[PDB]
Amino acid sequence: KVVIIGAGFAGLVAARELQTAGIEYEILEAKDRIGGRAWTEERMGRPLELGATWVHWFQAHTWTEIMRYGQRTEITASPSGNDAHWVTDGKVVKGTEDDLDEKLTAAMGVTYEGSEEYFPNPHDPLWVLSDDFDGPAEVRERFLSDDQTNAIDLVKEAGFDQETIDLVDAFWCAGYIGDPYTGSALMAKQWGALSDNRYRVMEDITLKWKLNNGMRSLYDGIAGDLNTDIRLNTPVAKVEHHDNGATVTTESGEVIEASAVICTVPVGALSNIEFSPALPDAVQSVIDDKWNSQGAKIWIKIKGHHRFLGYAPKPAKMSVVRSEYFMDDDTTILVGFGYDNTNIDLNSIEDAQAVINQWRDDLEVVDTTGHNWVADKWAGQAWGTLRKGQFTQGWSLFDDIDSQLFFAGSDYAYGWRGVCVDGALEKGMTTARQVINSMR
Numbered sequence: 001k002v003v004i005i006g007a008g009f010a011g012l013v014a015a016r017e018l019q020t021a022g023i024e025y026e027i028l029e030a031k032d033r034i035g036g037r038a039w040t041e042e043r044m045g046r047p048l049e050l051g052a053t054w055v056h057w058f059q060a061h062t063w064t065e066i067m068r069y070g071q072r073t074e075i076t077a078s079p080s081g082n083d084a085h086w087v088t089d090g091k092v093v094k095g096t097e098d099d100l101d102e103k104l105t106a107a108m109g110v111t112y113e114g115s116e117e118y119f120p121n122p123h124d125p126l127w128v129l130s131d132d133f134d135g136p137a138e139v140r141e142r143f144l145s146d147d148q149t150n151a152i153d154l155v156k157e158a159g160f161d162q163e164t165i166d167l168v169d170a171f172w173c174a175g176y177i178g179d180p181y182t183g184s185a186l187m188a189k190q191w192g193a194l195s196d197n198r199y200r201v202m203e204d205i206t207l208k209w210k211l212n213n214g215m216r217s218l219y220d221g222i223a224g225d226l227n228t229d230i231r232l233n234t235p236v237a238k239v240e241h242h243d244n245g246a247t248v249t250t251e252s253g254e255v256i257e258a259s260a261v262i263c264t265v266p267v268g269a270l271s272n273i274e275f276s277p278a279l280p281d282a283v284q285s286v287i288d289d290k291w292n293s294q295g296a297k298i299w300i301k302i303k304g305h306h307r308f309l310g311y312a313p314k315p316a317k318m319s320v321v322r323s324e325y326f327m328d329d330d331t332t333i334l335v336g337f338g339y340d341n342t343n344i345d346l347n348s349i350e351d352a353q354a355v356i357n358q359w360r361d362d363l364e365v366v367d368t369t370g371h372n373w374v375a376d377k378w379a380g381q382a383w384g385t386l387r388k389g390q391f392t393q394g395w396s397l398f399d400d401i402d403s404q405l406f407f408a409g410s411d412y413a414y415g416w417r418g419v420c421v422d423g424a425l426e427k428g429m430t431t432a433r434q435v436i437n438s439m440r
Protein backbone atom coordinates (compact mmCIF):
# COMPACT_ATOMS: atom_id res chain seq x y z
CA LYS A 1 0.00 0.00 0.00
CA VAL A 2 2.86 2.42 0.75
CA VAL A 3 5.16 2.33 -2.29
CA ILE A 4 8.85 2.95 -1.59
CA ILE A 5 10.95 3.92 -4.59
CA GLY A 6 14.53 2.76 -4.17
CA ALA A 7 16.23 0.10 -2.04
CA GLY A 8 19.10 2.16 -0.69
CA PHE A 9 19.51 2.73 3.04
CA ALA A 10 16.71 5.30 3.18
CA GLY A 11 14.16 3.05 1.45
CA LEU A 12 15.21 -0.08 3.36
CA VAL A 13 14.98 1.59 6.77
CA ALA A 14 11.65 3.24 5.87
CA ALA A 15 10.23 -0.18 4.98
CA ARG A 16 11.43 -1.70 8.25
CA GLU A 17 9.88 1.22 10.14
CA LEU A 18 6.53 0.76 8.36
CA GLN A 19 6.73 -2.99 9.05
CA THR A 20 7.06 -2.20 12.77
CA ALA A 21 3.86 -0.13 12.59
CA GLY A 22 1.95 -2.88 10.77
CA ILE A 23 1.69 -0.90 7.51
CA GLU A 24 1.83 -2.76 4.22
CA TYR A 25 4.55 -1.61 1.85
CA GLU A 26 6.44 -2.53 -1.29
CA ILE A 27 9.94 -1.46 -2.36
CA LEU A 28 10.53 -0.98 -6.09
CA GLU A 29 14.22 -0.83 -7.01
CA ALA A 30 15.48 0.03 -10.51
CA LYS A 31 18.70 -2.02 -10.27
CA ASP A 32 19.37 -5.75 -9.87
CA ARG A 33 20.86 -5.11 -6.38
CA ILE A 34 20.06 -3.30 -3.14
CA GLY A 35 22.11 -0.70 -1.27
CA GLY A 36 22.04 2.21 -3.74
CA ARG A 37 25.06 4.47 -3.30
CA ALA A 38 26.40 2.05 -0.69
CA TRP A 39 27.87 -0.88 -2.61
CA THR A 40 30.34 -3.41 -1.24
CA GLU A 41 31.80 -5.33 -4.17
CA GLU A 42 34.68 -7.74 -4.69
CA ARG A 43 37.21 -5.86 -6.85
CA MET A 44 41.01 -6.12 -7.20
CA GLY A 45 41.24 -9.06 -4.80
CA ARG A 46 39.07 -7.98 -1.86
CA PRO A 47 35.71 -6.40 -0.98
CA LEU A 48 35.85 -2.68 -1.80
CA GLU A 49 33.34 0.08 -1.03
CA LEU A 50 32.44 1.58 -4.40
CA GLY A 51 30.29 4.14 -2.57
CA ALA A 52 29.83 4.59 1.20
CA THR A 53 32.77 3.55 3.42
CA TRP A 54 33.30 5.27 6.80
CA VAL A 55 31.23 5.23 10.03
CA HIS A 56 31.44 6.46 13.65
CA TRP A 57 29.63 5.98 16.97
CA PHE A 58 28.84 9.75 16.99
CA GLN A 59 26.51 9.01 14.01
CA ALA A 60 23.40 7.98 15.89
CA HIS A 61 21.47 6.30 13.08
CA THR A 62 24.43 4.51 11.49
CA TRP A 63 25.75 3.39 14.88
CA THR A 64 22.42 1.90 15.99
CA GLU A 65 22.36 -0.25 12.83
CA ILE A 66 25.96 -1.32 13.42
CA MET A 67 24.91 -2.44 16.91
CA ARG A 68 21.71 -4.06 15.64
CA TYR A 69 23.40 -6.19 12.97
CA GLY A 70 26.32 -7.41 15.08
CA GLN A 71 29.09 -5.14 13.76
CA ARG A 72 29.98 -3.45 17.11
CA THR A 73 33.57 -4.75 17.08
CA GLU A 74 33.82 -5.20 13.30
CA ILE A 75 35.28 -1.76 12.55
CA THR A 76 38.91 -0.96 11.72
CA ALA A 77 40.65 2.39 11.42
CA SER A 78 42.15 3.38 8.06
CA PRO A 79 45.98 3.57 7.94
CA SER A 80 47.48 6.63 9.60
CA GLY A 81 51.00 7.98 9.97
CA ASN A 82 51.30 8.13 6.18
CA ASP A 83 54.03 10.01 4.38
CA ALA A 84 52.16 13.11 3.24
CA HIS A 85 52.50 15.07 -0.01
CA TRP A 86 50.71 18.18 -1.15
CA VAL A 87 50.72 20.34 -4.27
CA THR A 88 50.73 24.05 -3.76
CA ASP A 89 52.11 26.34 -6.46
CA GLY A 90 52.62 23.62 -9.02
CA LYS A 91 55.17 22.08 -6.65
CA VAL A 92 55.02 18.95 -4.51
CA VAL A 93 55.74 19.46 -0.82
CA LYS A 94 56.54 16.51 1.45
CA GLY A 95 55.76 16.30 5.14
CA THR A 96 54.20 14.26 7.90
CA GLU A 97 50.50 13.55 8.16
CA ASP A 98 50.72 15.54 11.41
CA ASP A 99 52.14 18.56 9.53
CA LEU A 100 49.18 18.46 7.18
CA ASP A 101 46.60 17.96 9.94
CA GLU A 102 47.90 20.95 11.90
CA LYS A 103 47.52 23.17 8.84
CA LEU A 104 43.94 22.01 8.25
CA THR A 105 43.16 22.37 11.97
CA ALA A 106 44.17 26.04 11.87
CA ALA A 107 42.12 26.61 8.70
CA MET A 108 39.02 24.86 10.11
CA GLY A 109 38.86 27.22 13.07
CA VAL A 110 38.23 30.06 10.66
CA THR A 111 36.06 27.78 8.52
CA TYR A 112 33.74 26.82 11.37
CA GLU A 113 33.40 30.47 12.54
CA GLY A 114 29.90 31.17 13.53
CA SER A 115 28.82 27.57 14.02
CA GLU A 116 28.25 28.20 17.74
CA GLU A 117 25.81 31.04 16.96
CA TYR A 118 24.11 29.18 14.10
CA PHE A 119 23.93 25.62 15.41
CA PRO A 120 23.53 25.35 19.21
CA ASN A 121 21.45 22.28 18.32
CA PRO A 122 23.39 21.01 15.26
CA HIS A 123 20.33 18.97 14.27
CA ASP A 124 18.27 22.17 13.85
CA PRO A 125 20.27 23.66 10.95
CA LEU A 126 17.70 26.32 9.97
CA TRP A 127 17.04 27.56 13.52
CA VAL A 128 18.49 30.99 12.64
CA LEU A 129 15.71 31.49 10.06
CA SER A 130 12.93 30.30 12.39
CA ASP A 131 10.48 32.34 14.42
CA ASP A 132 12.14 30.94 17.55
CA PHE A 133 15.45 32.60 16.65
CA ASP A 134 16.26 35.05 19.44
CA GLY A 135 19.78 36.15 18.52
CA PRO A 136 20.96 39.46 17.10
CA ALA A 137 19.87 40.40 13.59
CA GLU A 138 23.47 40.43 12.35
CA VAL A 139 23.75 36.69 13.06
CA ARG A 140 20.85 36.07 10.67
CA GLU A 141 22.47 38.37 8.10
CA ARG A 142 25.82 36.58 8.42
CA PHE A 143 24.04 33.22 8.15
CA LEU A 144 22.40 34.19 4.85
CA SER A 145 25.67 35.69 3.59
CA ASP A 146 27.54 32.47 4.41
CA ASP A 147 25.18 30.48 2.17
CA GLN A 148 26.57 32.58 -0.73
CA THR A 149 30.26 32.15 0.20
CA ASN A 150 32.36 29.07 -0.52
CA ALA A 151 34.52 27.49 2.19
CA ILE A 152 37.83 28.34 0.51
CA ASP A 153 37.16 32.08 0.37
CA LEU A 154 36.79 32.10 4.18
CA VAL A 155 40.38 30.88 4.43
CA LYS A 156 41.66 33.33 1.79
CA GLU A 157 39.94 36.28 3.49
CA ALA A 158 41.49 35.30 6.84
CA GLY A 159 44.98 35.87 5.39
CA PHE A 160 46.31 32.32 5.23
CA ASP A 161 49.16 31.73 2.80
CA GLN A 162 48.91 30.02 -0.58
CA GLU A 163 50.17 26.71 0.81
CA THR A 164 47.22 26.51 3.22
CA ILE A 165 44.79 27.75 0.56
CA ASP A 166 45.91 24.96 -1.79
CA LEU A 167 45.57 22.37 0.99
CA VAL A 168 42.08 23.60 1.88
CA ASP A 169 41.20 23.68 -1.84
CA ALA A 170 42.21 20.03 -2.16
CA PHE A 171 40.40 19.10 1.05
CA TRP A 172 37.09 20.62 -0.07
CA CYS A 173 37.39 19.23 -3.60
CA ALA A 174 37.04 15.90 -1.81
CA GLY A 175 34.55 17.10 0.80
CA TYR A 176 32.20 18.85 -1.64
CA ILE A 177 32.95 15.93 -4.07
CA GLY A 178 32.83 18.56 -6.80
CA ASP A 179 33.89 22.13 -7.51
CA PRO A 180 34.32 23.60 -4.02
CA TYR A 181 34.24 27.17 -5.34
CA THR A 182 30.53 26.80 -6.21
CA GLY A 183 29.69 25.34 -2.79
CA SER A 184 27.93 26.81 0.26
CA ALA A 185 30.20 27.42 3.25
CA LEU A 186 27.27 26.64 5.58
CA MET A 187 27.68 22.95 4.71
CA ALA A 188 31.20 22.98 6.18
CA LYS A 189 30.08 24.97 9.23
CA GLN A 190 27.38 22.41 10.02
CA TRP A 191 29.90 19.57 9.69
CA GLY A 192 31.87 21.49 12.30
CA ALA A 193 28.83 21.80 14.56
CA LEU A 194 28.15 18.05 14.27
CA SER A 195 31.82 17.37 15.15
CA ASP A 196 32.18 19.47 18.34
CA ASN A 197 33.78 22.16 16.11
CA ARG A 198 37.08 20.27 15.95
CA TYR A 199 38.78 19.13 12.76
CA ARG A 200 40.07 15.91 14.32
CA VAL A 201 36.57 14.87 15.39
CA MET A 202 35.17 15.73 11.96
CA GLU A 203 37.81 13.51 10.34
CA ASP A 204 37.26 10.80 12.97
CA ILE A 205 33.56 10.76 12.09
CA THR A 206 33.82 10.82 8.29
CA LEU A 207 37.21 9.41 7.30
CA LYS A 208 38.50 6.89 9.85
CA TRP A 209 36.49 3.76 10.76
CA LYS A 210 35.60 1.18 8.07
CA LEU A 211 33.24 -1.80 8.36
CA ASN A 212 35.23 -5.05 8.22
CA ASN A 213 32.19 -6.69 6.64
CA GLY A 214 31.26 -3.69 4.50
CA MET A 215 28.17 -1.55 4.21
CA ARG A 216 26.47 -4.67 2.82
CA SER A 217 26.51 -6.15 6.34
CA LEU A 218 24.12 -3.32 7.23
CA TYR A 219 21.93 -3.08 4.14
CA ASP A 220 21.65 -6.87 3.79
CA GLY A 221 20.82 -6.88 7.51
CA ILE A 222 17.92 -4.47 7.04
CA ALA A 223 16.70 -6.27 3.92
CA GLY A 224 16.78 -9.58 5.80
CA ASP A 225 14.37 -8.11 8.38
CA LEU A 226 11.74 -7.26 5.74
CA ASN A 227 8.80 -9.65 5.39
CA THR A 228 8.01 -8.31 1.88
CA ASP A 229 10.22 -9.18 -1.08
CA ILE A 230 11.95 -6.27 -2.78
CA ARG A 231 10.98 -5.88 -6.45
CA LEU A 232 14.32 -5.56 -8.24
CA ASN A 233 14.69 -4.52 -11.91
CA THR A 234 11.54 -2.43 -11.49
CA PRO A 235 12.24 1.23 -12.31
CA VAL A 236 9.47 3.70 -11.57
CA ALA A 237 8.64 5.98 -14.50
CA LYS A 238 5.74 8.08 -13.16
CA VAL A 239 4.29 9.06 -9.80
CA GLU A 240 0.74 10.35 -9.50
CA HIS A 241 0.01 12.01 -6.15
CA HIS A 242 -3.35 13.76 -6.21
CA ASP A 243 -5.38 13.91 -2.99
CA ASN A 244 -7.54 10.89 -3.90
CA GLY A 245 -4.58 8.53 -3.59
CA ALA A 246 -1.21 7.86 -5.22
CA THR A 247 -0.37 5.79 -8.29
CA VAL A 248 3.02 4.55 -9.48
CA THR A 249 3.74 3.44 -13.05
CA THR A 250 6.79 1.30 -13.75
CA GLU A 251 8.87 1.45 -16.91
CA SER A 252 7.05 -1.63 -18.23
CA GLY A 253 3.71 0.16 -17.81
CA GLU A 254 2.51 -1.65 -14.69
CA VAL A 255 0.32 0.65 -12.59
CA ILE A 256 0.44 0.21 -8.79
CA GLU A 257 -2.02 1.98 -6.49
CA ALA A 258 -0.64 3.39 -3.25
CA SER A 259 -1.85 5.17 -0.15
CA ALA A 260 1.44 7.10 -0.18
CA VAL A 261 4.76 7.07 -2.02
CA ILE A 262 8.15 7.45 -0.35
CA CYS A 263 10.60 8.44 -3.08
CA THR A 264 14.29 7.98 -2.26
CA VAL A 265 15.55 8.62 -5.83
CA PRO A 266 18.38 11.18 -5.62
CA VAL A 267 18.09 14.60 -7.25
CA GLY A 268 20.59 13.54 -9.92
CA ALA A 269 18.12 10.87 -11.06
CA LEU A 270 14.74 12.52 -10.40
CA SER A 271 14.41 13.62 -14.04
CA ASN A 272 13.77 9.95 -14.93
CA ILE A 273 10.37 10.22 -13.18
CA GLU A 274 7.33 12.15 -14.39
CA PHE A 275 5.40 13.61 -11.44
CA SER A 276 1.70 14.50 -11.70
CA PRO A 277 1.12 17.08 -10.38
CA ALA A 278 4.51 18.64 -11.12
CA LEU A 279 6.82 19.24 -8.18
CA PRO A 280 6.91 22.74 -6.63
CA ASP A 281 8.89 25.28 -8.66
CA ALA A 282 11.51 25.67 -5.92
CA VAL A 283 12.05 21.91 -5.90
CA GLN A 284 12.35 21.84 -9.68
CA SER A 285 14.99 24.57 -9.54
CA VAL A 286 17.12 22.38 -7.25
CA ILE A 287 16.65 19.38 -9.54
CA ASP A 288 17.68 21.53 -12.53
CA ASP A 289 20.72 22.90 -10.70
CA LYS A 290 20.97 19.60 -8.77
CA TRP A 291 23.42 19.42 -5.87
CA ASN A 292 27.16 19.77 -5.30
CA SER A 293 28.30 16.28 -6.29
CA GLN A 294 29.99 16.04 -9.69
CA GLY A 295 33.14 14.26 -8.45
CA ALA A 296 34.19 10.64 -8.23
CA LYS A 297 35.86 8.01 -6.04
CA ILE A 298 38.70 5.77 -7.25
CA TRP A 299 40.52 2.73 -5.87
CA ILE A 300 44.12 2.48 -7.13
CA LYS A 301 46.50 -0.46 -6.69
CA ILE A 302 50.26 0.22 -6.80
CA LYS A 303 53.30 -2.01 -6.47
CA GLY A 304 54.88 -2.33 -3.02
CA HIS A 305 53.64 -1.50 0.47
CA HIS A 306 53.49 2.28 0.75
CA ARG A 307 51.98 4.49 3.46
CA PHE A 308 50.92 7.37 1.25
CA LEU A 309 48.77 10.49 1.59
CA GLY A 310 48.44 13.04 -1.21
CA TYR A 311 46.58 16.33 -1.55
CA ALA A 312 46.21 18.39 -4.73
CA PRO A 313 43.96 21.36 -5.58
CA LYS A 314 41.48 21.79 -8.38
CA PRO A 315 41.68 20.89 -11.23
CA ALA A 316 43.63 17.74 -10.28
CA LYS A 317 42.18 14.39 -11.36
CA MET A 318 42.17 13.41 -7.67
CA SER A 319 42.44 15.83 -4.74
CA VAL A 320 42.82 13.43 -1.76
CA VAL A 321 44.51 10.01 -2.10
CA ARG A 322 45.38 7.73 0.83
CA SER A 323 46.64 4.20 1.46
CA GLU A 324 43.88 1.91 2.71
CA TYR A 325 44.91 -1.74 2.30
CA PHE A 326 48.27 -3.49 2.20
CA MET A 327 47.69 -6.59 0.09
CA ASP A 328 49.27 -10.03 0.35
CA ASP A 329 50.91 -9.89 -3.10
CA ASP A 330 53.05 -6.89 -2.05
CA THR A 331 50.70 -4.22 -3.40
CA THR A 332 48.86 -1.27 -1.84
CA ILE A 333 45.27 -0.24 -2.52
CA LEU A 334 44.68 3.51 -2.14
CA VAL A 335 41.40 5.43 -2.14
CA GLY A 336 40.96 8.72 -3.97
CA PHE A 337 38.38 11.49 -4.27
CA GLY A 338 38.33 13.95 -7.16
CA TYR A 339 36.20 16.96 -7.98
CA ASP A 340 35.34 16.12 -11.62
CA ASN A 341 34.00 12.73 -12.70
CA THR A 342 34.50 13.64 -16.37
CA ASN A 343 38.28 14.22 -16.01
CA ILE A 344 39.04 10.70 -14.71
CA ASP A 345 38.42 7.20 -16.05
CA LEU A 346 38.26 5.22 -12.80
CA ASN A 347 39.08 1.96 -14.61
CA SER A 348 42.01 3.17 -16.76
CA ILE A 349 45.45 2.23 -15.46
CA GLU A 350 47.00 5.20 -17.31
CA ASP A 351 44.55 7.62 -15.69
CA ALA A 352 45.27 6.17 -12.25
CA GLN A 353 49.00 6.45 -13.00
CA ALA A 354 48.49 10.12 -13.87
CA VAL A 355 46.85 10.51 -10.44
CA ILE A 356 49.83 8.99 -8.63
CA ASN A 357 52.19 11.05 -10.81
CA GLN A 358 50.69 14.20 -9.27
CA TRP A 359 52.97 13.47 -6.29
CA ARG A 360 55.41 10.61 -7.00
CA ASP A 361 56.32 9.45 -10.49
CA ASP A 362 58.31 6.51 -9.04
CA LEU A 363 55.23 4.55 -7.89
CA GLU A 364 53.69 2.10 -10.36
CA VAL A 365 49.95 1.51 -10.79
CA VAL A 366 49.02 -2.09 -11.63
CA ASP A 367 45.21 -1.91 -11.32
CA THR A 368 42.42 0.56 -10.70
CA THR A 369 38.65 0.50 -10.28
CA GLY A 370 35.63 2.61 -9.46
CA HIS A 371 31.97 3.24 -10.24
CA ASN A 372 31.15 6.61 -11.83
CA TRP A 373 28.00 7.40 -9.87
CA VAL A 374 27.51 10.66 -11.77
CA ALA A 375 27.21 8.76 -15.09
CA ASP A 376 24.90 6.18 -13.43
CA LYS A 377 21.35 7.05 -14.49
CA TRP A 378 19.93 5.80 -11.20
CA ALA A 379 22.19 8.14 -9.16
CA GLY A 380 23.45 10.98 -11.32
CA GLN A 381 25.58 12.22 -8.47
CA ALA A 382 28.01 11.12 -5.79
CA TRP A 383 27.09 12.07 -2.20
CA GLY A 384 24.82 15.12 -1.96
CA THR A 385 26.65 18.41 -1.35
CA LEU A 386 25.42 21.99 -1.37
CA ARG A 387 25.88 24.73 -3.93
CA LYS A 388 25.68 28.35 -2.80
CA GLY A 389 22.12 29.08 -1.69
CA GLN A 390 21.13 25.42 -1.20
CA PHE A 391 21.60 25.34 2.57
CA THR A 392 18.65 27.71 3.08
CA GLN A 393 16.82 27.25 -0.26
CA GLY A 394 17.74 23.71 -1.19
CA TRP A 395 17.57 20.49 0.79
CA SER A 396 14.76 21.68 3.07
CA LEU A 397 12.32 22.38 0.19
CA PHE A 398 11.58 18.69 -0.39
CA ASP A 399 9.54 18.30 2.79
CA ASP A 400 5.79 18.94 2.85
CA ILE A 401 4.88 18.16 -0.76
CA ASP A 402 1.44 16.69 -0.05
CA SER A 403 -0.06 13.83 1.96
CA GLN A 404 0.61 11.35 -0.86
CA LEU A 405 4.23 11.95 -1.89
CA PHE A 406 7.16 12.23 0.52
CA PHE A 407 10.86 12.59 -0.30
CA ALA A 408 13.37 10.65 1.79
CA GLY A 409 17.09 10.23 1.37
CA SER A 410 20.35 11.35 2.83
CA ASP A 411 20.23 14.53 0.76
CA TYR A 412 17.28 15.88 2.81
CA ALA A 413 18.41 14.93 6.33
CA TYR A 414 18.70 17.47 9.13
CA GLY A 415 22.00 16.08 10.41
CA TRP A 416 24.77 14.39 8.37
CA ARG A 417 23.04 15.31 5.15
CA GLY A 418 24.12 13.74 1.85
CA VAL A 419 27.68 12.87 2.86
CA CYS A 420 26.77 10.02 5.25
CA VAL A 421 24.64 6.90 5.42
CA ASP A 422 23.60 8.43 8.76
CA GLY A 423 21.50 10.94 6.82
CA ALA A 424 19.78 8.25 4.75
CA LEU A 425 18.98 6.24 7.87
CA GLU A 426 17.79 9.39 9.66
CA LYS A 427 15.53 10.62 6.87
CA GLY A 428 14.20 7.24 5.74
CA MET A 429 13.10 6.51 9.31
CA THR A 430 11.58 9.93 10.03
CA THR A 431 9.80 10.03 6.65
CA ALA A 432 8.26 6.66 7.51
CA ARG A 433 7.14 8.26 10.80
CA GLN A 434 5.50 11.08 8.81
CA VAL A 435 3.45 8.45 6.97
CA ILE A 436 2.72 6.51 10.19
CA ASN A 437 1.56 9.71 11.90
CA SER A 438 -0.65 10.68 8.96
CA MET A 439 -2.22 7.22 8.90
CA ARG A 440 -2.76 7.18 12.69
Ligand SMILES: Cc1cc2nc3c(=O)[nH]c(=O)nc-3n(C[C@H](O)[C@H](O)[C@H](O)COP(=O)(O)OP(=O)(O)OC[C@H]3O[C@@H](n4cnc5c(N)ncnc54)[C@H](O)[C@@H]3O)c2cc1C
Pocket residue numbers: 005006007008009010011028029030031034035036037038050051052053054055206234235236237264265266269272273296297373377378379381382383408409410411418419420421422423424
Ligand atom coordinates in the same frame (compact mmCIF):
# COMPACT_ATOMS: atom_id res chain seq x y z
C1 LIG B 1 31.45 7.88 -3.66
C2 LIG B 1 30.64 7.92 -2.39
C3 LIG B 1 31.26 7.65 -1.17
C4 LIG B 1 30.54 7.70 0.02
N1 LIG B 1 31.20 7.43 1.21
C5 LIG B 1 30.51 7.47 2.31
C6 LIG B 1 31.19 7.17 3.55
O1 LIG B 1 32.39 6.89 3.64
N2 LIG B 1 30.38 7.20 4.66
C7 LIG B 1 29.03 7.49 4.68
O2 LIG B 1 28.44 7.48 5.76
N3 LIG B 1 28.38 7.78 3.51
C8 LIG B 1 29.10 7.76 2.39
N4 LIG B 1 28.45 7.99 1.20
C9 LIG B 1 27.06 8.43 1.23
C10 LIG B 1 26.03 7.32 1.21
O3 LIG B 1 26.35 6.38 0.18
C11 LIG B 1 24.67 7.96 0.93
O4 LIG B 1 24.44 9.06 1.81
C12 LIG B 1 23.51 6.98 1.06
O5 LIG B 1 23.99 5.69 0.65
C13 LIG B 1 22.33 7.43 0.23
O6 LIG B 1 21.19 6.62 0.56
P1 LIG B 1 19.77 6.93 -0.06
O7 LIG B 1 18.88 5.72 0.25
O8 LIG B 1 19.39 8.25 0.42
O9 LIG B 1 20.05 6.99 -1.65
P2 LIG B 1 20.49 5.88 -2.68
O10 LIG B 1 21.47 4.97 -2.07
O11 LIG B 1 20.91 6.63 -3.95
O12 LIG B 1 19.19 5.01 -2.95
C14 LIG B 1 18.26 5.35 -4.00
C15 LIG B 1 17.87 4.06 -4.67
O13 LIG B 1 16.84 4.32 -5.66
C16 LIG B 1 17.15 3.61 -6.83
N5 LIG B 1 16.48 4.28 -7.94
C17 LIG B 1 16.87 5.41 -8.61
N6 LIG B 1 16.02 5.80 -9.53
C18 LIG B 1 14.99 4.87 -9.45
C19 LIG B 1 13.79 4.73 -10.16
N7 LIG B 1 13.39 5.55 -11.14
N8 LIG B 1 12.98 3.69 -9.82
C20 LIG B 1 13.37 2.86 -8.85
N9 LIG B 1 14.49 2.90 -8.11
C21 LIG B 1 15.26 3.94 -8.47
C22 LIG B 1 18.67 3.61 -6.89
O14 LIG B 1 19.10 2.57 -7.76
C23 LIG B 1 19.01 3.36 -5.42
O15 LIG B 1 19.03 1.98 -5.07
C24 LIG B 1 29.17 8.00 -0.02
C25 LIG B 1 28.54 8.26 -1.23
C26 LIG B 1 29.27 8.22 -2.41
C27 LIG B 1 28.56 8.50 -3.71
